[PDB]
């Protein structure tokens, strides 16, 4: 059985997803089908798949069963918890297709309920704000990238980060760096770490590159932008504030409070079609 | 004003394309539009665009104006095609959509008229044979990859190749090899070359990997597979023959005649849809 599946392609700061509508919970999307669809040259190509289903139809969903549930799969076929960027696209999809009736709403995920606000949306483009939780600064550590040692802050955003504000780092020197997989303290980070290399806060903005664990450099890491803003604010003596974070895939704005944080950024829905697998 | 464009996505041995129907030649597809569409994370993503248009309506075409013309664009916008896989997919589209009424036909291209035969097709899949022209064997040479020297045969198929057939190298060993950008004799190749590393003929088959010039390793290179077949034949003391070539993107069959060559291989059309873009 080769199967034809209606889909949409989109991205959120160029962290890209295939959206699969399945409002009646009819599709059994297997790991193998995930991989096949996300293969960029043989399939459609993406970082992952966002299946659109009600929380009622996801077994083990902890959340209110009337909510839409972001059934997120990584491109390698694994189940994934949550995605700071993919939530924006999922929210954009729900709102722009009239599946929710308010600009402010919740979405279910395997990591719990996520609250979103649509600031602007049409069928192609949106600006979405997501609640990202209290950043938890777990300590002070270092990594080594290609012989050069960087100091950072451990930040727990639900997943582990080492966010390294580099004194003296310009946006051009950042773009010109060669990145390789970092070496780090494996006692501090026993399950691996996402490393952000970040400029100092200047006119309420910074730039970042990120080496995501198990993946390598990416266009954008949503949780990583919050970590980076956390570290930028720390390095400037501030415990709270608003930071524009520039990543290779675009720009986002992070707000850090005492008791929470938000990530605001774009969402784009690029194509609609039908794909045949298998 | 924004434009909604019907497209299809397909590939031929995993050299992938966005096909854009434009039978009435209404779309001005600019190089920047190509780059946007072919960006794998921000767009649809592909190695290139195949625009479906009559030769009459393509600027600078002077082939028979009544042919369909593979208006091929590389993902950076450029017009020159190197590997030739696009032709299979183009043929498959044209046949399966009823735009031609024979399994044997000609297609207009920037590199001249190409002759194809559809051996089988449906809406989704096809096996297509393409006339690839007379390989121009340019002679023995070498390259170094990652400290190892390899002999191979130079073949110009429109662009330069060095196909290095490696006695003793198994298919497994070939897959485990760690490729890097080859160094080569710059006198023989003063502007670089596409390098194939190929196993020796066994059961009329070889395995190949390919480092394409200024690209790096790719899944497939149609012209590369023809050079590989020429090289595998020469490695066995032969000038002519039929060779199955296994690349990471799948399997093709090359035939080398004393006066020409063909490449037969798969095509897949995997999706249909619409994409919105700004008019330029």
Author numbering:
A (entry chain A): 1 to 278
B (entry chain B): 1 to 280
Task: Please give sentences taken from the publication describing this entry.
DapF (EC 5.1.1.7), a pyridoxal 5-phosphate-independent amino acid racemase, catalyzes the stereochemical inversion between l,l-DAP and d,l-DAP. DapF plays an important role in the biosynthesis of l-lysine because DAP decarboxylase only recognizes d,l-DAP. Each CgDapF monomer consists of two distinct domains: an N-terminal domain (NTD; Met1–Asp131 & Gly268–Ile277) and a C-terminal domain (CTD; Met132–Thr267). Two catalytic cysteine residues are positioned at the active site, which is located at a cleft between the two domains.
To reveal the molecular mechanism of CgDapF, we determined its crystal structure (2.0 Å resolution) via the single-wavelength anomalous dispersion method, using a selenium-substituted crystal. In one monomer, two catalytic cysteine residues (Cys83 and Cys221) were oxidized, forming a disulfide bond with each other; in contrast, these residues were reduced in the other monomer. The formation of this disulfide bond also caused a large conformational change in the loop that contains Cys83 (Ala75–Gly84). In contrast, in the oxidized form of CgDapF, the loop was positioned 5.8 Å closer to the substrate binding site, compared to the reduced form, resulting in closure of the substrate binding site. In fact, no reducing agent was added, neither to the reservoir nor to the protein solution used for crystallization, indicating that the protein was crystallized under somewhat oxidized condition. In particular, the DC-loop of the oxidized monomer makes a close contact with one neighboring molecule, whereas that of the reduced monomer makes no contact with any molecule. Under oxidized condition, the position of the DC-loop occludes the active site, which inactivates the enzyme.
